[PDB]
Swiss-Prot record, chain A:
Belongs to the WD repeat G protein beta family. Ribosomal protein RACK1 subfamily. Component of the ribosome, a large ribonucleoprotein complex responsible for the synthesis of proteins in the cell. The small ribosomal subunit (SSU) binds messenger RNAs (mRNAs) and translates the encoded message by selecting cognate aminoacyl-transfer RNA (tRNA) molecules. The large subunit (LSU) contains the ribosomal catalytic site termed the peptidyl transferase center (PTC), which catalyzes the formation of peptide bonds, thereby polymerizing the amino acids delivered by tRNAs into a polypeptide chain. This is Small ribosomal subunit protein RACK1. Pfam families: WD40. It comes from Saccharomyces cerevisiae (strain ATCC 204508 / S288c). The lineage of its organism: Eukaryota, Fungi, Dikarya, Ascomycota, Saccharomycotina.
Swiss-Prot record, chain B:
Belongs to the universal ribosomal protein uS3 family. Present with 146000 molecules/cell in log phase SD medium. The gene is RPS3. It is found in: Cytoplasm. It comes from Saccharomyces cerevisiae (strain ATCC 204508 / S288c) (Baker's yeast). Component of the small ribosomal subunit (SSU). Mature yeast ribosomes consist of a small (40S) and a large (60S) subunit. The 40S small subunit contains 1 molecule of ribosomal RNA (18S rRNA) and 33 different proteins (encoded by 57 genes). The large 60S subunit contains 3 rRNA molecules (25S, 5.8S and 5S rRNA) and 46 different proteins (encoded by 81 genes). Component of the ribosome, a large ribonucleoprotein complex responsible for the synthesis of proteins in the cell. The small ribosomal subunit (SSU) binds messenger RNAs (mRNAs) and translates the encoded message by selecting cognate aminoacyl-transfer RNA (tRNA) molecules. The large subunit (LSU) contains the ribosomal catalytic site termed the peptidyl transferase center (PTC), which catalyzes the formation of peptide bonds, thereby polymerizing the amino acids delivered by tRNAs into a polypeptide chain. The lineage of its organism: Eukaryota, Fungi, Dikarya, Ascomycota, Saccharomycotina. This is Small ribosomal subunit protein uS3. The modification Phosphoserine is found at residue 40.
Amino acid sequence: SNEVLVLRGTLEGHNGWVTSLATSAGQPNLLLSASRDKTLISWKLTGDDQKFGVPVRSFKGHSHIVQDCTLTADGAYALSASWDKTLRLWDVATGETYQRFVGHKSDVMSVDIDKKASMIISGSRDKTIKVWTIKGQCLATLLGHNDWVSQVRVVPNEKADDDSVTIISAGNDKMVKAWNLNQFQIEADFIGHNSNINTLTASPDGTLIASAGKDGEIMLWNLAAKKAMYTLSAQDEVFSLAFSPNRYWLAAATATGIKVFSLDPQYLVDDLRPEFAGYSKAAEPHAVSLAWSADGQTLFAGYTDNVIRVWQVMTAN
Amino acid sequence: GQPVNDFIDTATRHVLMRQGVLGIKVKIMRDPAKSRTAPSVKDY
């Protein structure tokens, strides 16, 4: 008895690498995708075996490629971080930029908004983790990284925000960092990585950290305990990590494919590699981004051949 | 230093008046650009 992921088709409308993905909770039919075509596309999905119906909107407004994006829990806003040293707040309905976040001195590589949609963090290549309001006002400048800042995430609270507002960042100085944004200071120094950390994500409950990069080492930490847990070998470079909303699964985006691990019981669930037409094996597109759906049954994957490939969990004999 | 021997010029003139004599020290500095000749976790 297995739980099988099946290729459900393709979503194509981009001109560049699909570098980020974000799903919705208010409307589980909405997918926001940030790409290297300097545009974000929002899709309303009609799930058929080969094709997916309507491609709703395009968000042209970023001068250089759009790196990261996130939706809100209702699905009404968009938050895009670009290489034009700026961020933007869109309306997924009309495409209206409600605000331009201008402050960084280099390419903004990641963005995430908190639970109540009121605090917007941003990490860039100028080793600066800035914290903004929703009105475009920078109220914090969290420096500390001595190399690039590849990813900044807000950790999901479990005690209903009991005065603890924490964010986790992954530097290319081979370190993970945990910040407390109540006084704006460093709260934890996660050391252990041997190469450049490409991504990081906090588990649904808010006590686990998964950081991987070029070494291929998906390292798991315990943030509530602030102690190193362990390390899973993902061999090749891992570009994006994500924790399943319901299950205890960890899907990583490796330069070969998409490796889905389990944490209880401990085994590699799957290794997702889609068929490519007319390419060498050192020329095959890899996963640069991935987003989990609202129920843990759908896995969206933003690739480097400009195509968002999707998988869905079944149950086998 | 030596930039004092190269660039600043000092002159002292004792000006004689009706009450007493005074000391005039003029010190002029000219422009020097016109000089032709296992994983561990720490917590705080």
